[PDB]
Structures are given as structure tokens and as C-alpha cells.
Design a protein around this nucleic acid. Sequence first.
RNA 1: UGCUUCACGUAGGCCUUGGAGCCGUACAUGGUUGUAACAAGCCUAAGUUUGAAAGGUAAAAACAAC
RNA 2: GCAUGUACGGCUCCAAGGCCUACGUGAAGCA
Length: 994
Amino acid sequence: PQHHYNTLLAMAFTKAHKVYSDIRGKVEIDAAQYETKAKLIEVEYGKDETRGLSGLEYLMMSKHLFSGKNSNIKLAVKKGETEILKEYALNEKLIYTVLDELRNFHSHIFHEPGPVSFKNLYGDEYKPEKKLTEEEWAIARDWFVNRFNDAKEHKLKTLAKVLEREGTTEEKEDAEKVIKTISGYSFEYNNCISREALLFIACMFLRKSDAAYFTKKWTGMKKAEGVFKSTQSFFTDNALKESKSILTLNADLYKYRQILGVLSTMPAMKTDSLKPFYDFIKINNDSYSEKAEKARSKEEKEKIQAFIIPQRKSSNYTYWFMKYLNDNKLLDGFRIAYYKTPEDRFMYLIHNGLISQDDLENIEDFKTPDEKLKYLREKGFNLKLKMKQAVGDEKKSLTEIYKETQRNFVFKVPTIENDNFCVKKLNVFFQTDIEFNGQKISVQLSVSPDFLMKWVFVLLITGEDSIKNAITEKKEKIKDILKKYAEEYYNRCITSNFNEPLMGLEASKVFPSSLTSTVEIDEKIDKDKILMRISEKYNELTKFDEENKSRKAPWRFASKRKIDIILDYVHLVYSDRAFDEKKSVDAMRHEALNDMEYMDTFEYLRYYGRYRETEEFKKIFFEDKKLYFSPILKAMKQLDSLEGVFNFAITGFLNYLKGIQSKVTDENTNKYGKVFKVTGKSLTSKIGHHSEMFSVNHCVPQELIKLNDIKGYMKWKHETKDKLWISDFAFIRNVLESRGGFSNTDYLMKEVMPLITFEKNEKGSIKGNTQMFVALSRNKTNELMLWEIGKYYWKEATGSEFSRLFKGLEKNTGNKITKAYRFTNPYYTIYQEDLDIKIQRKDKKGKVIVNSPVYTIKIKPKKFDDEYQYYEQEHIVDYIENYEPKKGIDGHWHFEELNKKIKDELARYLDDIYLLMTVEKHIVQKDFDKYASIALNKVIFDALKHKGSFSADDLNIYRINVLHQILQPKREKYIIIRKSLIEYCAENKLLKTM
RNA sequence: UGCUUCACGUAGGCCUUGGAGCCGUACAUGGUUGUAACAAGCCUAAGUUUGAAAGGUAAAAACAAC
RNA sequence: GCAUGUACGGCUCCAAGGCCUACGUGAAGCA
Ligand SMILES: [Mg+2]
Ligand SMILES: [Mg+2]
């Protein structure tokens, strides 16, 4: 029957078009691919895995790979996938148009369609909406027949593999009937596309459940195993499986996983007063490791090993704030400092016109950088001797070039694909442009890591990076304010106004001490500071000396510190002698170690045993550097291996430091102030020069961002009202803790702290009380911020918020841990706890109906990437409202079993629409003159078997319910209409012929 | 007697992240005088979640000589 | 007998995800 196949194909193509359009709504870079910037791994193909990708996976991987956010993340693909993905990305628009056309052609009521020609006629008065020409349709049809042939060949080979593998009498007859029909049908006929090809095309862009239903309804047969369950399974190797993740190449769940892995470990802070914490942690770790290396079962070992606390030696919070700012297309007007690459050095040398004297060596065959630089290094390119080998213009040019070369960071316009932010001592570097008297001046700012954190906090909480000004009202962006600060700093530096607040900042946090605190005449060095410096040096030297004689030093342990100590001792003795001998700066400079001599001396001392008889060592340490190395000539001659010369150096150093602590009076403080380099309190005569230096290259404090107008700030400020030492970070911690999160500070202060006793002070408090607490507080805040960023990336991956309640800890009341770290830390088990999602009626497009109920559904977090993307929540709200589902144990309306009931109702509705469409088609195809004399519903009602059971209104309600798939229970008036329709179908015997 | 769909275990592979150790490459920085600590780190307040002010120490960014 | 930073490649451990398989179960529908 042609009508049966036509209706089934119309339904299948409509479903395929709806599913395909549910993924793409806008352009999404279609037909504009430019390759992927990702390190592709050619992963081997799994055994016993059927080849072939559905159209949905083609679309998803074409979108994910050729996106732009995939910059260097080391994705995994199979063999021969990139070129076919490029072909699909080229012809996806044609594929979409072909699917839409085919759906429109098959879904016809008036003048029932015939077979689809090889040309796909689609014209004349029948279809005067020609959207595909001969060549475009030819390309799409060629792609389809290629895929059809590939699937047929793969299925035939898999079928042929069965007969060799043993088998019996029953197996032989089952494999014989299926090969002849699988190899039987073909894509091509006499200008007629076969029905099997159309079903294959329709099922290629569906899901496995709908494809299975359509294949089962394709042929009645006997409802048993359809041709050994092999012809029916021919069309389902495509039609994406569901319950299979589509976010493998998302590049936003990648950062979420990175953040989770970072947060799943305990920090190792370097505070002196936190040592008992880590001592207890080490003892516990060692004891439980020893206990775990005695087990006999996997489960017992897993239970024992849950008490071990992993640790990390450092954390990078400044990188994650900068990455968050770069992802949201912020900055955009600054110039960030990036790490220098060898390509950057090569390009700088090329543009600077310095390797132009390479006689055009044309080393372009190497292509990759860091090898051409190797060739110049082998050639004899040095660049470190070219500040004295040319006329006076050399100083203006080569010194600046050398200064640029020594810097290891470069300034570039920020980009999404750029990630190598320069982080030096937790700081970042920005470069802005200001206008003064109609001139563009570049200003460099060192931005603290707490400015960025407050910026990210303001962006995350309010949603906008705008801060309301205290005066003159109005809202200003945080991308701004920085530029105003730079301009005002420049203006104040020119005006020399360093005794008033800049932006209500109490200008000692800005304007460093060279400008805000000066004296007129040079100060007099006090007696106390020299003694303090001498005592500190003595204490450090004797501490290292005492610590050295415990590892027994058999030419091992630290050697750099020893060489530094010898060199410092020699230099200090030489300086003390030279000041008394009254030598000028140039006299001492020529009599000391320059760069080359210092490098040679360091190498010789590092390899002391290697050079003791070579003439180079004698020439350096006994001929040239005679006066400088005088205090050590006697020891170096009768010694070797450097382990004795270090002891002699430490002995001489300690003897000298003891011998000086009684030769420092008020009448000779100048000499040792010069020797130990203690200075005064700057000069007023050099205020202008320092202002000129500082007006361009200054720093940005973290108090520039004010959280006064954030929601809840006034209540928090009034609540405490007595913690005189409180700061703005307590507000951040309070806000982030009220939203749900975990930090290792909670575990440290509630599970480990009560078990240990701290060393007490003279007063009776904890020794090192202040800094320790600050340290702990610091950790908490940073960790909380990181978690927030992670949650943000979750919203960028699954499209839904992360709503979950984290349980709070309880203080320890025992003498043992009794609480495993891997069971207390929630980031270890974060994929095994239900999350909340809010479901609301969507109606048409992105328009949530106000004053409508909102439902809360609990869903496992491993179902957010497979069977939650593009789910058509209208079915969920229809099932919740129209039906009356029951709430199970801990009643919360789980997404599971809701999916199951919804799928069952969808199958029932599919049967209903098939039946109604067949009956409507038969009714219309006959009484065309009667219909042409809504009135169509009245025509159907008159041409039926109703007496008093239902009116035209009931038929209309049934038709709108069935056509649009509004999920409702069976009720009563629906059953009689279905019985009448079945009676009509059986009376004419419409679907019983072969 | 069985059929598919989910979910949980058990055992394998094949990839990708996170911490720690042993490593190796490859590159950059390292010297003597003065100017230079606004930014970041360390030490000082409370036996429980208080980074404000103050006192030391501290050379990350910068300027000029060999 | 060397310190810091950067990028890469290993080995070694732990852990987390994703894809394939092969055995058990638990549940929903169908013959
Ligand atoms: Mg999943
Ligand atoms: Mg302070």
C-alpha cells in the first residue's frame, strides 16, 4: 500500500526535521569551517564496534570541532573522521533543505503523492516552492547514496562473518534469507528512489527509539524476530543511541573537570604556625598507608585508603580569574602581558633588522622556530658585545634592543585562544593609553590578584560589571575606572599633589614612599639598625651552619647556598677593606667580579674537583683576581672538594661578625652604613624625577573596587558592627557560603584542629596567632571563588544551573579522625548526587509564561549530557499537569521513570496520529467534490459512524489533541472515537492488503 | 518460556583531565655602584572562620653609570 | 655538587571522567 508508506515516511521526516532543528536555530558558523585548532589524536578503533555515525553525531561534532573554543585541548577522534566532518560541514545546509523538502513532499493530504524521482521533481504547480536546483540536490543525493552504500557494505560484511563462525542447521537458514534481501534493494531505479532508501535517510537523522518504532511499524509480518533481527536492525546502526554523551568535545566541561580536580586536594600552605596541622596530616597519611599495605580485599583496601589526604604544593588562582575574564570577551582595550615564545624572539629579530647580516641564509626549510635560533647560535650570533663596537648611535639603538631582549614577557591584544598570562609574584600586568594635552601616552599598571577577584565576584553576583559611584550617582564599568585612575594618577604626578585622597582612597595606599614621605637633607644613620642587620646575618649564618652538620654532607645536599656564602664573605671583606683604603667607584668596579668573571668563578666552584690543576683556575684565582680573593688564597691552596673551603668560609664569616659587634660606635656608623647598605628616607630634591618614573609604571590597589551597593551589604555591615578588624573579604565569604560550597579550611578547623595542641605564647595565646588565622581565611575565600567559576562553566556546558545543597560539617568530639577525607570532601562524590532543575511552561519560543507554576525535578548529574539536551520540556509539564503522578520515597518527582512514562505516551500518540492521518487521507481522497461544496472537520464528522456518542466539537478536540501531541490520559470520550475510527478502517480494509 | 529499554555492580581494554615523586630535553634570567617596596610574600592581635589600621622585613615592576 | 621561570616527552603511583566490550542483577512496558 502506497498510503501506508507515505504516511510513515511523512511522520518520520517530520520527526527528523524537528529533531534536527532543535539543535541549530541560527547560523552557527554553517558552511564557514576553517579547520580545528586542536591537537587531534588518531585513536585506534574499538573491537566489535559497528562503524557508522548518525547525522546527529555528524552535526554535533562538526559544530564542536569547528567552533573556536577548542584551542589546544588534545581531543580524541577516530580514523578518517576529519575529512568527512569537513564534507558534512560544507553540505549541511543542503542536507537540512533536503530533509525539509522531503518532509513537505511526503506530508500531503490533497492529491496523494507518488514516488520520488531520481531528479526529485519538486516542481510545476504541485510544488512551486523550488528550493533545490539540479546540482545541489545532486550533491545531497550523492552524499546520501554514498552513506547508503557504505552501510550496506558494512552490514553485508558483518552478516557474512557469521556463517564461518561455526553455526548449525537453524543458523544456516536464518543467514541465507537475510543476505539476499539486504543485498537486494538498491538506492537506484528508473528515476525512482526506493522506499528502503527513504526510510534509511529518515532514520539516519532520528534517535534509536523512534527509529525502532518506525522500523517495527514498517512491516506487519508476524511481530516476531524480523528476518533474524537483522533486516530490522539494518536501519538502526545510524539513529544515535541516546544515553550516550554528546559533550565529549565541549571544551567547557573540560575546564569544569580541571577545576574539580584542583579542588579535590588539600593545600600545603607555608605558614610557620600551621606546622602542627601538616605534621598530624603526615603522621595520619603514613599510618593509614602502612595499614593499607596489609589488606586482602579490594573493598577493604578502598575503605582503608579513604583516610589519606592528598596535597598540592601550589595553587594558581590568578590564572583562573584571568581565564574567566578572557572567556567573557572582557578586557578588550587593554594590552595584557604574555609569556615569550621562541617564535616571538625569532619574529622580533626579523622585524628589528638585526639578522639582516645573515647574508639571506634562507633557512625557511626548518619552518618551526627554536631551530633557526639554534643556527644563529652555532653561527656566532651573540648580540651581547654590540654595545661597544660602533659609533655613538649604537647606544641609542642596541641598548634598547638588549633591554627588550632581556624581558621575558610581551604585550599583545587579548584573544580567546591566548592563555599564557604572565603571572609574576601573583600579579598581572596591564597597559592602557591615556590622553594628556592631545598626546597618547602608554601607562603600565601592575594589577594585584585581589582586584581581579573582586571584579569576578561583582560580575558573578550582580551579572553586570558596573559599580555605582558614591558621588554624582550613575553607573561605571570596571573596564572603566581603571583608565580614570591612570589618568588621575598621571595628572597628580604632574601637579605634584600627594597629600589628598585620589578616589577616596586615603592616598598612602597609592603614591609610594618616594613621593609621599621625604626629607630635605640626608638623614643620619642610627646605631641600632646596623646592629640589627649584623645580628640577623649572624643568626641566619649560624642556623645554616648548625643545620649543615646533620646530613653529614658527603659532597651532597645544597651546594648553591654554600657558594653564595663564600662569595658573599669574600665580597663583604673586600668592601670593608676598600672603604678604608679609600678607593673610588671605578677603582672598586675594575677590582671586582663582572658578569663574565662571576660566571667563570661560579662554574669553577661548582666543578671544584674538575679544575684544580688546570691553568685557567690558577690564572683566575691567583693571577688576575689577586686583591679581591686575598682572604681565601691560603685555604684554597691546601684543600679540595669545596667541603672544607665552605667550612673555612663560614668560620671566617662568623669570626668577622663576632669581631665587629664591638667596633660600632656613633662616630663610625657611616662606614658600616655604607658596608651593610642601610639608607635614609629619600630626598625632596628628587621628587620630580621619581614622579616622572612612577607616573607611567605604577600599581593598582585592590581597594579601587567598592562593594557598597551589592545586595545585602548594609545588613552584613550592621550585623557585625563590633569586629574592628573585619574587611571586605568577610562579605565575599559570607555571600559565597550562603550559596553553597565547601572549602578545605572547614575540614582543617573542624576535623583536625581539636585533636592537636599548639605552642603557647608568654601571654597564654597561640604562638603565631595572627598570620595563621589569616592564612586559613585566605584559603577559604579563594577556594569558594574557584568553585563559583566552576559552576559557571557547568552552565556553559549543560545549559542548566548547578543547584545542590552541601551538608555542613560538625566539630570533632573524639581523639581520632573518624571521618574519611574522601567521604567528607563533596568534590570526590559530585557525579553521584541528585541536582535540581526548574521546569516551567515554555509555550512558543523563549517566552516563559508569568504567573505559571514552576516544578522542581531531581536529576542525576550523569544524565545532563545524553538524555537532557533538547528534551522538549512541554512533554514534561503536560505529563505533570494532565496526569497525576505519584511522588516516591523522598517524594521529589525524579526525571527517571518520568522519561519512561513520557516515552510510552509518545508511542501511543504516534499510533494515534498514524491512524488518524490514514483515515483523514482516505476520507479526503474520495469526497473531493463533496468537500469543495472548518468544513473539513464537518465533512469527516458526516462521513463517519456517529449517532449520539460525540458531536463535531468532540471530534475537533480529539483532532487537536492527537495532531499536536498533548499528553492526556485515556478518559472516556477518546475511546469511542478511536473505536469508530478502527471500525471505519476495518470496514474498508484499508491496511490489510499486501 | 522469554523480549527490548533504563540503572547498579564485576573484569578488561582505549583515550582525556587533577595531584605527588624520579627524571630527562630546550630556552631565558644570574656581575659591581647609586635611585627604586604603591603591587605580592614573610613575622607580630583572638582555642575556632575579625585579610581594617600600625611596627619590621622584603627588590616584583622601573631610572642612570661599567 | 646550581637556583627560579617557561614549554615538551617519558617512567611511576593514586585518583576522577568519556567510549567500547563480556557476565550478573533491580525496575517499566511487550509477546
Ligand atoms: Mg552521561
Ligand atoms: Mg595591613
